[PDB]
């Protein structure tokens, strides 16, 4: 099979402007394993992003987490851009400062 | 309750990428990390500081090397160019007594197709590909015994050691920080979002309340943080007056009570 990825974007702690934080992109439920994930700042790809070991779930679909240290701002935007075979163009998911 | 290895091999990895990697889990926590590049099994998170019996991560490393070769070998016994993905779920769970319950399932290209009949000591499956790999492993004439050893003795011995020298890591409890916010959506409608930050263990409930009357769960979401903790959110569409009559209820092991939450 091919499974198309789910994408979630969230912070590790509630987002207070000026307090340091972590931003997350959780990608999950996809097959096969090859995947490409960039984190964005107002469009601009973020350099020192880390990631966890590629693992899978009970249904054998793959998941993975990309994270980056950062400091939120009322007029700064973040997003996750993902590319995977099951997709025509890479999908960008905006970080909603609560979800 | 329970220790699980997630093995994955691929038949054509991009360079940089390992052809075969494994992650060991104790419940929802990763304790182990291995891949075919470094070729060494190593601890994760707090488990770096767990007091082991000093040859432990050697025995983990050999067993996973054995399993590395069995996996790459499986691709040779297949008859396309694919490419291919092989996946294994091996481990154990301590029973309703103090005997262990083996798990050994396998999956090819994301479809389960094979397992290990412990009461016979063989890999089994309907598929020609299952039968091919099974026969091939069955021939590397060490491997069925090793596999058997692995699940019946190795695996459930490791679990007890961890259960004893890391029991505190497993009992870990962390309440979530909670938030409840409303955003504009369609005219007439706003979206409510009850979010739960940095909690452990994974098990948690979010339910909405229309006034005090039950409002249902909403549409849940759920993910991991970088530190082994977790995140969750859950949303509801409501119309655009009438939002402060809603609230959220959370419940989680790290709290003494279900915690109500307003806007």
From Swiss-Prot, chain A:
Give the primary localization class.
secreted
Kindly list the cysteine pairs connected by disulfide bridges.
Answer: 25-80
Q: Which superkingdom, per the lineage?
A: Eukaryota
Outcome following mutation: residue 59 to P: Increases tendency towards amyloid formation
Q: Where does it sit, as one GO cellular component term?
A: plasma membrane
Assigned keywords, A-Z: Amyloid, Amyloidosis, Disease variant, Disulfide bond, Glycation, Glycoprotein, Immunity, Immunoglobulin domain, MHC I, Pyrrolidone carboxylic acid, Secreted, Signal
User: Which Gene Ontology molecular-function terms are recorded?
Assistant: identical protein binding; MHC class II protein complex binding; peptide antigen binding; protein homodimerization activity; structural molecule activity
Record note on modification: Glycation of Ile-1 is observed in long-term hemodialysis patients.
Q: Which residues form a coiled coil?
A: none
In this UniProt entry, the residues modified to Pyrrolidone carboxylic acid are 2
Protein role = Component of the class I major histocompatibility complex (MHC). Involved in the presentation of peptide antigens to the immune system. Exogenously applied M.tuberculosis EsxA or EsxA-EsxB (or EsxA expressed in host) binds B2M and decreases its export to the cell surface (total protein levels do not change), probably leading to defects in class I antigen presentation.
Q: Name the family.
A: Belongs to the beta-2-microglobulin family.
Q: Which disease is it linked to?
A: Immunodeficiency 43: A disorder characterized by marked reduction in serum concentrations of immunoglobulins and albumin, and hypoproteinemia due to hypercatabolism. Patients may suffer from recurrent respiratory tract infections and severe skin disease.
Query: Subunit structure, briefly?
Result: Heterodimer of an alpha chain and a beta chain. Beta-2-microglobulin is the beta-chain of major histocompatibility complex class I molecules. Polymers of beta 2-microglobulin can be found in tissues from patients on long-term hemodialysis. B2M alone (not in complex with HLA-I) interacts with M.tuberculosis EsxA (ESAT-6) and an EsxA-EsxB (CFP-10) complex; the tripartite complex can be detected in the host endoplasmic reticulum. The B2M-EsxA complex can be detected in patients with pleural tuberculosis and is stable from pH 4.0 to 8.0 and in the presence of 2M NaCl.
Q: Output this protein's name.
A: Beta-2-microglobulin
Its source organism is Homo sapiens (Human)
Note the residue range shown relative to the complete protein: 21 to 119 of 119
UniProtKB/Swiss-Prot annotation, chain B:
Start and end of every Ig-like C1-type domain? 175-262
- Keyword annotations for this protein? Cell membrane, Disulfide bond, Endosome, Glycoprotein, IgG-binding protein, Immunoglobulin domain, Membrane, Phosphoprotein, Receptor, Signal, Transmembrane, Transmembrane helix
Q: Which GO terms describe its biological process?
A: IgG immunoglobulin transcytosis in epithelial cells mediated by FcRn immunoglobulin receptor; immune response
Q: Which domain of life is it from?
A: Eukaryota
Region named Alpha-3: 174-263
Which region ranges are annotated with the description Alpha-1? 1-83
The disulfide bonds in this chain are: 92-155, 194-248
Role: Cell surface receptor that transfers passive humoral immunity from the mother to the newborn. Binds to the Fc region of monomeric immunoglobulin gamma and mediates its selective uptake from milk. IgG in the milk is bound at the apical surface of the intestinal epithelium. The resultant FcRn-IgG complexes are transcytosed across the intestinal epithelium and IgG is released from FcRn into blood or tissue fluids. Throughout life, contributes to effective humoral immunity by recycling IgG and extending its half-life in the circulation.
Protein name in the entry: IgG receptor FcRn large subunit p51
Its taxonomic placement starts with:
Eukaryota, Metazoa, Chordata, Craniata, Vertebrata
């Amino acid at each position: 099979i091919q499974r198309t990825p789910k994408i979630q974007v969230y912070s590790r702690h509630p987002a207070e402007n000026g307090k340091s934080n972590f931003l997350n992109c959780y990608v999950s439920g996809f097959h096969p394993s090859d995947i490409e994930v960039d984190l964005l700042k107002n469009g601009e790809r973020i350099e020192k992003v880390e990631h966890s070991d590629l693992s899978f779930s009970k249904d054998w679909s793959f998941y993975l987490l990309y994270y980056t240290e950062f400091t939120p701002t009322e007029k700064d935007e973040y997003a996750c851009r993902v590319n995977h075979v099951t997709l025509s163009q890479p999908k960008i998911v905006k970080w909603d400062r609560d979800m | 309750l329970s220790l699980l290895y997630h093995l994955t091999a691929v038949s054509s990895p991009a360079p940089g990428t390992p052809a075969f990697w494994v992650s060991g889990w104790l419940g929802p926590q990763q304790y182990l990390s291995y891949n075919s590049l470094r070729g060494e099994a190593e601890p994760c998170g707090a488990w770096v500081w767990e007091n082991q019996v000093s040859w432990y991560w050697e025995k983990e490393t050999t067993d996973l090397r054995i399993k590395e070769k069995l996996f790459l070998e499986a691709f040779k016994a297949l008859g396309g160019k694919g490419p291919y993905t092989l996946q294994g779920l091996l481990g154990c769970e301590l029973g309703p007594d103090n005997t262990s319950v083996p798990t050994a399932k396998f999956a090819l290209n994301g479809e389960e197709f094979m397992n290990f009949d412990l009461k016979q000591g063989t890999w089994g499956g309907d598929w020609p590909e299952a039968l091919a790999i099974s026969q091939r492993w069955q021939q590397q004439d060490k491997a069925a015994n090793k596999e058997l050893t692995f699940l019946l003795f190795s695996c459930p011995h490791r679990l007890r050691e961890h259960l004893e020298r890391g029991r505190g890591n497993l009992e870990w409890k962390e309440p979530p920080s909670m938030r409840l916010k409303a955003r504009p959506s369609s005219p007439g409608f706003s979206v409510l979002t009850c979010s739960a930050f940095s909690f452990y263990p994974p098990e948690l409930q979010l339910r909405f309340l229309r006034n005090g009357l039950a409002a249902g769960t909403g549409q849940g979401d759920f993910g991991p943080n970088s530190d082994g903790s977790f995140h969750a959110s859950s949303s509801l569409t409501v119309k655009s007056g009438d939002e402060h009559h809603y609230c959220c209820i959370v419940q989680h092991a790290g709290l003494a009570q279900p915690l109500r939450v307003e806007l």
